[PDB]
Amino acid sequence: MLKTGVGVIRMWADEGSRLSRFRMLFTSFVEPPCTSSTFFCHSNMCINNSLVCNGVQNCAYPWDENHCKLFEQITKTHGTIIGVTSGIVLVLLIISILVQVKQPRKK
Amino acid sequence: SKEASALGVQNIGGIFIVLAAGLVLSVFVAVGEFLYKSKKNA
Amino acid sequence: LNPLSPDIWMYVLLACLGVSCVLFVIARFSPYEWYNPHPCNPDSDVVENNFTLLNSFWFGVGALMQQGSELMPKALSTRIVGGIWWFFTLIIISSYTANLAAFLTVERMESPIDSADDLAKQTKIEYGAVEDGATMTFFKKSKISTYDKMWAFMSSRRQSVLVKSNEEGIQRVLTSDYAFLMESTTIEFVTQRNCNLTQIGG
Amino acid sequence: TLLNSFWFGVGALMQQGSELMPKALSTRIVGGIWWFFTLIIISSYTANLA
Amino acid sequence: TLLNSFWFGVGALMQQGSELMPKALSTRIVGGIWWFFTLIIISSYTANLAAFLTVERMESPIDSADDLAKQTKIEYGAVEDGATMTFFKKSKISTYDKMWA
């Protein structure tokens, strides 16, 4: 927690440049009291200016960008596709059936 | 405790195949019997 | 409608249509099916079949529904297709009943947690406590085996689930599955001042 | 007849059915829906008792 | 007839039945016994299907070291020239020489 508003990051290397990395992320607005415009991720952590669900886990607790939020049956891998091909077959069948529903008689 | 799943085509697929085989065999035997009776009359 | 996946049902309906229509088209072309109508028939010439579109369709529907029908298939083709359809319907219904019984008798024998040790055996529900608030330390210095494995899970997660303040853990349990081992009196004060939260165990 | 209509219903709930099955169309939809209801009830009863 | 008896036989297997019911008390005995046999078969098949779909235990295809040999479908392996290869090389039990081959 940077108490102030000025940041200081240093790395000292000594013929060891094969060091994996230093890689971090800093998030602002820990100070601001919460208002309607900003967002309450966690204790004294309303940080929102555009930060709401920006693709980065940018809050101490996972609330700021974490899980913000009939057509299902049609969305089958190919069961719907084979089903509708069979449906076309069955429409052909019904239309054929009506012909001899009305066509033949006794003898 | 994991046995809560609806049956699907991955669990019931052979019956439709059997039905199709039955239908094609029905058509074959139907035309065969039609020619049988027509030939016997002829 | 649950026990069968929402893929077979359309398969079943379209197969019913197809089987019924195949039955109808065969029954309208057969050298055996045409029948002399009169109850006391002295060799007249008014023969016909009995299969219309509606008749075959509702024969298929009834057979799928296991309540029977009115038609009696006569020729080899109609009887063989009827038999295959009956076999299909019988196994479909039996599988449906078996799966519904499976759901009910696998749900009925679920055991919701009611004690610390039964919780310890379970794994999915992550644990927690307000850290170093003299509560987790009890697990830290404990000697009992079950509490030792509790603390082992605690240390395995290690700030994945170890909340720092009461109310944050309260909201965590509200919006997730959690245990949040904390002292009794505050649990009373919260459970009786809210709902959805149950004092579990002793 | 109303007597035989009630008979058809009560004998359709139990899985045997009468011989007075519908010979028209409009009544056949009621017959089918009733059959489906009976099948669902009996299968669910067997499942829950098992 | 030559076919009606077979038709009724098959039709009594599935719980609908044809309309060729017997009339003599000499063959209706056969009808009843056939009914009993088919009722038992079906009402046990449903029970077994429910049993399988409720308590299901899957088992491994292979369950021994030798089963890996003479199977030629799993396509197993090992670490490249570590310690396993050292054993399989020169192992003259020949139960693992097929393995190494």
Find which of C1, C4, C9, C17 to mutate to test the A interface (most A CBs within 10 Å of its CB).
Answer: C17
User: Please, what is the Cα angle at E53 between E51 and E56, to 5 degrees?
Assistant: 85
CA–CA separation, C119 and C201 (whole Å): 10
Compute the nearest-CA separation of C109 from chain A (Å). 30
Contacts of E42 (CB under 8 A, 6+ apart): C90, C94, E15
Compute the nearest-CA separation of B4 from chain E (Å). 9
Interior/surface letters A66-93, b for 16+ CB within 10 angstroms, e for the rest? eeeeeeeeeebeebbebbeebbeebeeb
Question: Taking CB atoms and an 8 Å cutoff, what residues of chain C touch A104?
Answer: 28, 48-49
- Consult the annotation and say whether C188 binds a ligand: no
Burial of A38 (0-12, 13-18, 19+ CB in 10 A): middle
Interface partners of D (3+ CB pairs, < 8 Å)?
C
CA torsion A54-A57-A58-A61 (nearest 10°) is: 130
CA–CA separation, E101 and E82 (whole Å): 17
Find which of B3, B10, B15 to mutate to test the E interface (most E CBs within 10 Å of its CB).
Answer: B3
* Interface residue E50 vs chain C (CB under 8 A): yes
> Pick from C23, C56, C10: which is nearest to A86 by CA?
C10
CA–CA separation, A30 and A26 (whole Å): 11
Q: Are C128 and C171 in contact (CB under 8 A)?
A: no
First to last CA, chain E: 65
Interior/surface letters C127-148, b for 16+ CB within 10 angstroms, e for the rest? bbbbeeeeebeebeeeeeeebe
> Collapsing DSSP states into helix, strand and coil, what is residue C178?
strand
- Consult the annotation and say whether C183 binds a ligand: yes
* E34's tokens: 């056939």
Question: Taking CB atoms and an 8 Å cutoff, what residues of chain A touch C11?
Answer: 79, 82-83, 86
Burial of C58 (0-12, 13-18, 19+ CB in 10 A): buried
CA–CA separation, C52 and C27 (whole Å): 9
User: Please, what is the Cα angle at C182 between C125 and C149, to 5 degrees?
Assistant: 50
Phi first, then psi: give them for residue C78, nearest 5 degrees.
Answer: -65, -40
> Collapsing DSSP states into helix, strand and coil, what is residue C4?
strand
Look-up of token digits 């011989």:
D19
CA–CA separation, A66 and C175 (whole Å): 12
Contacts of C55 (CB under 8 A, 6+ apart): C70, C71
- Contact flag for D and C (3+ C-beta pairs < 8 Å): yes
Find which of E5, E54, E55, E56 to mutate to test the C interface (most C CBs within 10 Å of its CB).
Answer: E54
Beta-carbon neighbour count of residue C9 at 10 Å?
A: 14
Look-up of token digits 């009890």:
C138
CA-based nearest residue in chain C for residue A106: C48
Compute the nearest-CA separation of C35 from chain D (Å). 20
- Contact flag for C and A (3+ C-beta pairs < 8 Å): yes
Q: Are C21 and A93 in contact (CB under 8 A)?
A: yes
| DSSP label at residue B38 | H
Beta bridge partners of residue C35, listed in sequence order: C48
Residues of C near B (Cβ–Cβ under 8 Å) read 2-8, 11, 15, 18-19, 22, 26, 29-32, 75-78, 80-81, 83-85, 87-88, 91-92, 95-96, 99, 102-103, 106-107, 109-110
User: For A58, left (φ over 0), alpha (ψ -120 to 50), or beta?
Assistant: alpha
* Side chain identity at residue C196, one-letter code: N
Contacts of E36 (CB under 8 A, 6+ apart): none
* D10's tokens: 């009560």
Q: Are B8 and C7 in contact (CB under 8 A)?
A: yes
* Side chain identity at residue C155, one-letter code: S
CA-based nearest residue in chain B for residue C86: B19
- Contact flag for D and B (3+ C-beta pairs < 8 Å): no
Q: Which long-range contacts (CB under 8 A, 24 or more apart) does D4-10 make?
A: D9/D34
- Asked if A83 and C11 come within 8 Å (Cβ–Cβ), the reply is yes
Question: Taking CB atoms and an 8 Å cutoff, what residues of chain E touch C79?
Answer: 7
Contacts of C89 (CB under 8 A, 6+ apart): C63, C64, C65, C66
Compute the nearest-CA separation of E44 from chain C (Å). 11
Q: Are C139 and C165 in contact (CB under 8 A)?
A: no
CA–CA separation, C135 and C35 (whole Å): 89
Look-up of token digits 């229509």:
C21
> Collapsing DSSP states into helix, strand and coil, what is residue B15?
helix
* Side chain identity at residue B3, one-letter code: E
> Pick from C128, C133, C130, C32: which is nearest to C75 by CA?
C32
> Pick from D25, C53, C17: which is nearest to A99 by CA?
C53
Smallest Cβ distance to D28: which of C58, C68, C101? C58
Contacts of A100 (CB under 8 A, 6+ apart): C24, C25, C28, C53
Beta bridge partners of residue B7, listed in sequence order: C4
Method used for this model?
cryo-EM
